[PDB]
Amino acid sequence: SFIKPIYQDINSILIGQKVKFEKLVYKFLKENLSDLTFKQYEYLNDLFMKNPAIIGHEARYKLFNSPTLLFLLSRGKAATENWSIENLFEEKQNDTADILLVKDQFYELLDVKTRNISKSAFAPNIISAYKLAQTCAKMIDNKEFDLFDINYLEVDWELNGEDLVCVSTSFAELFKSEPSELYINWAAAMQIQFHVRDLDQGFNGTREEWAKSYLKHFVTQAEQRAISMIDKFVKPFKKYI
Amino acid sequence: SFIKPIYQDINSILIGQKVKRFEKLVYKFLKENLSDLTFKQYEYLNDLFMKNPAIIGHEARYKLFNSPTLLFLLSRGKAATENWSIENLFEEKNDTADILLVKDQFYELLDVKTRNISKSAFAPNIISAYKLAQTCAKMIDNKEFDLFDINYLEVDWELNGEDLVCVSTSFAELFKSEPSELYINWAAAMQIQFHVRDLDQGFNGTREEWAKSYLKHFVTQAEQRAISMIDKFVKPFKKYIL
DNA sequence: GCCGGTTAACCGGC
DNA sequence: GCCGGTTAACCGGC
Ligand SMILES: [Ca+2]
Ligand SMILES: [Ca+2]
Ligand code: NA
Ligand code: NA
Ligand code: NA
């Protein structure tokens, strides 16, 4: 992680800060690691602007130089072909990542999770367990085991008067967690869910092993969900029909 | 529907309306034209508890709904209900409804569906298929077949300069649709999905028939999803762990 | 045309 | 502690 080494710095600047979008972690990152930091759409704009000679989606999709990163970051074919310096990508809540840090052809996908710590703790959607499954599949098929990390920054806040105030933060790395410990909440858009501060970081094996261990986990949890569907959505309603 | 009789009015008033870059506008209109019938869901709960100050605790307060199904559809949780006070009112919350219209103890649950008419069409979450199943089961168990409607108001809008502007609307009633034709998107929080504009409205049966028919549909779709998951989420990935 | 996956967290049961 | 269902619409593949 490019962020981990300066976590103490970030934590100190965020705590006590106030919003009247605490995802102004971007501001700090952009101002301290200006060459590395992009919002996802910015990175895509940047990428395409720097290759004016490349037109149409097929060619622009080659710019990624990576099937896995293509899958994680790129917009759709029509959006890509229609892109121009006069028609730039804008932010979208559907984008995989909030912030991208990129250096030496290595990518850190950062996802900020904001959290009102005044309320009963509710583990947020982290990422589609299905998207992550495809990601691991693609990592394996293309042997891309040293290309990117997916990391999370929890920003805790509470209402104090007229404004929300940050009171703490946490940071963790998806690929340092034990895959079998990942909670997959099928109803909630098949999303993995955890609080960043609770994420175990004790995985010892390789990235490839992580990917293989995750796929086994995912496949296993899918089977369990299908079974659970009978018990929760079928059996209790049989009697009315 | 309490809205239906003035929908022509509603449709005309809303078209041309702008919001700075619409549900609130729908509410304002209903308030002005049906002031006595119109509430935000939290507003209705607040009103109910305000007129029963001697009724404290969640149990006693739950008894005020006088309906298992409505309790299920409208109430807040136990702690929230017990902690309610005049100084600690409910505010907007995954509440079932956007707006309630109630008259003579009949309830219309209204959900506004806003829609960017400029983008590729994408049918939005309408309501949880599972919440709906539970609802149907409670209607049956309690024989509450003439108590409430669940209705939808689509508000189409496009970006025009610095403003969002409404260009058209549509209205439809859930319980007038054919239950077996409702699309359950399991991945999408198990939500029924449709565009209000597209919802068929020719259902021929009683409310109880609707409920039973929906339950059959729900149970069938759940069984098929269970199987589909192996096909979609297991098979394609088994090769990496064989 | 047809089809269904994803982002944002967020409440409250026992 | 442990567990998981709901609201907001929204995008792009053949
Ligand atoms: Ca985020
Ligand atoms: Ca709504
Ligand atoms: Na995410
Ligand atoms: Na709502
Ligand atoms: Na809804």
Side-chain angles (χ1 to χ4, degrees), chain B residues 8 55 64 125 213 231:
Chain B
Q8 294 301 153
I55 308 311
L64 289 168
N125 298 351
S213 187
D231 278 19

Side-chain angles (χ1 to χ4, degrees), chain A residues 84 87-97:
Chain A
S84 71
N87 192 27
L88 304 171
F89 291 130
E90 305 174 56
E91 195 154 36
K92 55 190 273 75
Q93 40 57 103
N94 187 33
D95 275 351
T96 298

Side-chain angles (χ1 to χ4, degrees), chain A residues 23 98 111-114:
Chain A
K23 212 194 62 61
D98 283 324
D111 190 338
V112 177
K113 316 314 288 187
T114 64

Side-chain angles (χ1 to χ4, degrees), chain B residues 23 40 93-99 110-113:
Chain B
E23 184 265 318
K40 295 292 293 162
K93 177 180 90 165
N94 54 170
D95 274 348
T96 302
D98 284 323
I99 302 175
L110 183 66
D111 191 330
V112 180
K113 293 290 149 196

